[PDB]
Paper text:
During HIV-1 or HIV-2 infection, the capsid is a necessary component that protects the viral genome and recruits host factors while trafficking to the nucleus. The capsid is comprised of approximately ~1,600 copies of CA molecules, which oligomerize into ~250 hexamers and 12 pentamers (capsomeres) to form the distinct fullerene cone. In this study, we leveraged the approach of templating the HIV CA lattice assembly on liposomes, together with stabilization by the small-molecule host factor inositol hexakisphosphate (IP6),75–79 to produce regular HIV-2 CA lattices. We report the first high-resolution structures of HIV-2 CA capsomeres in their native mature lattice using single-particle cryo-EM.
The icosahedral pentamer was nearly identical to the pentamer from the CLPs with a model root-mean-square deviation (RMSD) of ~0.7 Å. Consistent with the high resolution, excellent density is observed, and we can confidently build an atomic model of the CA molecule in the assembly. Instead, the HIV-2 CA structures exhibit several additional polar contacts between adjacent chains, particularly between NTD helices 2 and 3, which could explain how they modulate forming pentamers and hexamers. This subtle rearrangement suggests that the 58CVGD61 loop of HIV-2 functions more gradually than the switch mechanism proposed for HIV-1.64,65 In accordance with this model, we observe icosahedral pentamer-only particles without kinetically trapping a molecular switch in a particular state by mutation. We observed density for IP6 in the central pores of both HIV-2 CA hexamers and pentamers, with clear density for R18 side chains.
Author numbering:
A (entry chain A), B (entry chain A), C (entry chain A), D (entry chain A): 1 to 222
Write the structure that this text describes.
């Protein structure tokens, strides 16, 4: 992370060992589950690219997922090296502008990452861009390791409607389908895959029942 | 959060990553359960509106609940923009007074939030007002996702009276009913929905038995 | 319909009784089924609005569907009376420009409909605009009377994969859902709702199998 | 279609609505079955490319099959734009020669299609070339939707030999296999997949029995 010091300059404070150990624990227990994507973001907040590399280096043993996060990073960096091209011959005595690889931290020092992150002129938020690239990689890992598909989720005959709602929305988090497909699933598939009685109360509510109206109506049905 | 520095001025210290990661964990495990409302308050204590937005941004994937917390915030801000109207033409060189949107932090910088929070003259506690608005939103989410209704809760034939009391009061926390309805439930419904024997001992106690007297009397009955 | 005669002018030839009787038969046998929408278009080709009214008048007894086709026509005419407003004071000795009601034929003679349909200057195709409005009305009737929902369709244990494909696509024709939802259903729901064996061969094909590849692979499976 | 008028010139008479409605019915009932290919040819006889487009536009809802007929048309037009290249700079006051797209009618007026179809010099039969391209597309649709494969067809123990012959030849119509494979199937597979008794009478006939000899011999066997 970065702390400001007297003179208006900034320095690097290494991520706490227990901040790194929390990340490890999460990846070892949730197995790249939907929750890992937000868990990574909260534990990587205010981090330079250098620190994000260490967090990944602490969870490298999960090689399959790391290979997926690594192929997504290279592509989001290539797109940065195509749409943010070298401006031209950089003047001497000046830091080069960041390339996709600098945003990652692989070809750049943490100080360079800090100089960009806090440029008085055109600050480049290299830490947040790289966290966004890794979140695309982790979300692809959440989908690949997702244990139950949205379609398979079906309310148990006795299962309370809210727990069936809880499992239905958790699988939808993994789904990478178009947002309209997500809206049609929450409005059509969720009434389609409910136990016989809850299905009669939901159809009873009428057309386009909101989730609050559906949860309120099926509370204690079954 | 806010730390005071030499000169009598205040600065902003970003919420710790592990303070943010605790919030995520809670929302991912308690599923907007009654406990989330107090858990949010303890982890948002001494926060500017800016920080409260980040905590919410770390739990955005729970879109249904976030939509409910977001509709409650807009209404508590509209009521602030009606009962705390722009005083009139603000003098130049002065910070504008906060509007419902400034209390949220959406249309305002953290420094402005800090200047109000610590105004030498008429300090506006924007952080606490916004936490109160979100607590109304989370409490509506606790009620919507509540799995068991107060009425359905019924003591098991062998269930110890205290565990039946524990489940009865946990559902009452979710209930948004008038306080008198809450007092009549704790004094009438709790004796009505007890296993046959405990019901005879409670009626034996007499009229208006206190909870302590009821727990003491039914200890070891069944 | 319209025939051209010597002098460069056009006249009206009444729709054949057996062209009208075919329409009746279809509506009496397919019961506003998906097939009725194309059947109407083929039997209403080259028709003035006047003729389209008679076809509808021959199937008026189906009052519920006619009320739906009539509410859709009034709205598509109101939108025409808002986006194609009276240009201004029409000069004397000239036919007024068509309004939503003229496109229908209700407030206009067939000759006026023909004069517009074949205007040397800015011909307005009133017959085709009204056929399009009625097709929106019939398609809403196809959806309302659709007997099986896309989701319910599930391949029989012995049913050949192609017949299950035939029923799956016929229900999709009735579906008015967004096109992406239609693409996700044909690529995901169609493999999800197949009998156990065909489901194993389809997953065997790999990711994004085309319909031809799926029909070829499951031919004779079961 | 095209009618000749006084002066030696030709004009276009729009395909009858009931000629178009027959086509619709067939495609809606035979589901792109082998019979659709001949049914299309008889109902498209003496048609300009313009009319053939309308027939297809009346059966567009069958999107999967239409996509197959559309990919076959583009390829048969590309082959026409490669083997029948623009002759060179066309003289002014003259109709351009037809390209694959003109044969389809997509980039050409019906009058141009008629001028070519009835050129006094080098008439190009654009209507028949496009019908041939669509027949390749429909035949691919017959094969894709074919419900029973030639190999699977096996005479029922009681099924009369002629009905088994009827099903065997109907599946062979769908088969796109080399003609020799078609001759070997009709001479070997048809005796191989007959019920035990008919198989003994057919082997009894001797080597290379004609279909007439086989039908005559197995009449009333079983
Ligand atoms: O809530 P606490 O009583 O303070 O316990 C905390 C809590 O762990 P648990 O709540 O799951 O028991 C911390 O996690 P937070 O909820 O505060 O975010 C965790 O710190 P981590 O972020 O690293 O997980 C820390 O565990 P540890 O000390 O192993 O780092 C642990 O403190 P104690 O276990 O010492 O009570
Ligand atoms: O194919 P055909 O031998 O000419 O029979 C036709 C055919 O009806 P069917 O094919 O269903 O038996 C006509 O329909 P098309 O397929 O030609 O479009 C139909 O005319 P409609 O369009 O009005 O249905 C007409 O029936 P009808 O004479 O009652 O009008 C009928 O002719 P026949 O029944 O006299 O043989």
């Amino acid at each position: 992370p970065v702390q400001q010091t007297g003179g208006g300059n900034y320095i690097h404070v290494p991520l706490s060992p227990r901040t790194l150990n929390a990340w490890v624990k999460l990846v070892e227990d949730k197995k790249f589950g939907a929750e890992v994507v937000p868990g990574f973001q909260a534990l990587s907040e205010g981090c330079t690219p250098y620190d994000i590399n260490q967090m990944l280096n602490c969870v490298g043993d999960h090689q399959a997922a790391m290979q997926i996060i690594r192929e997504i990073i290279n592509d989001e960096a290539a797109d940065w090296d195509a749409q943010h091209p070298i401006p031209g011959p950089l003047p001497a005595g000046q830091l080069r502008d960041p390339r996709g690889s600098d945003i990652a931290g692989t070809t750049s020092t943490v100080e360079e990452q800090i100089q960009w992150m806090y440029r008085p002129q055109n600050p480049v938020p290299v830490g947040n861009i790289y966290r966004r690239w890794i979140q695309i990689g982790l979300q692809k890992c959440v989908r690949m390791y997702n244990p139950t598909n949205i379609l398979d989720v079906k309310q148990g005959p006795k299962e309370p409607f809210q727990s069936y709602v809880d499992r239905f929305y958790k699988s939808l988090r993994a789904e990478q389908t178009d947002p309209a497909v997500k809206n049609w699933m929450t409005q059509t598939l969720l009434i389609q895959n409910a136990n016989p009685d809850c299905k009669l109360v939901l159809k009873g509510l009428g057309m386009n029942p909101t989730l609050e109206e559906m949860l309120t109506a099926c509370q204690g049905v079954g």
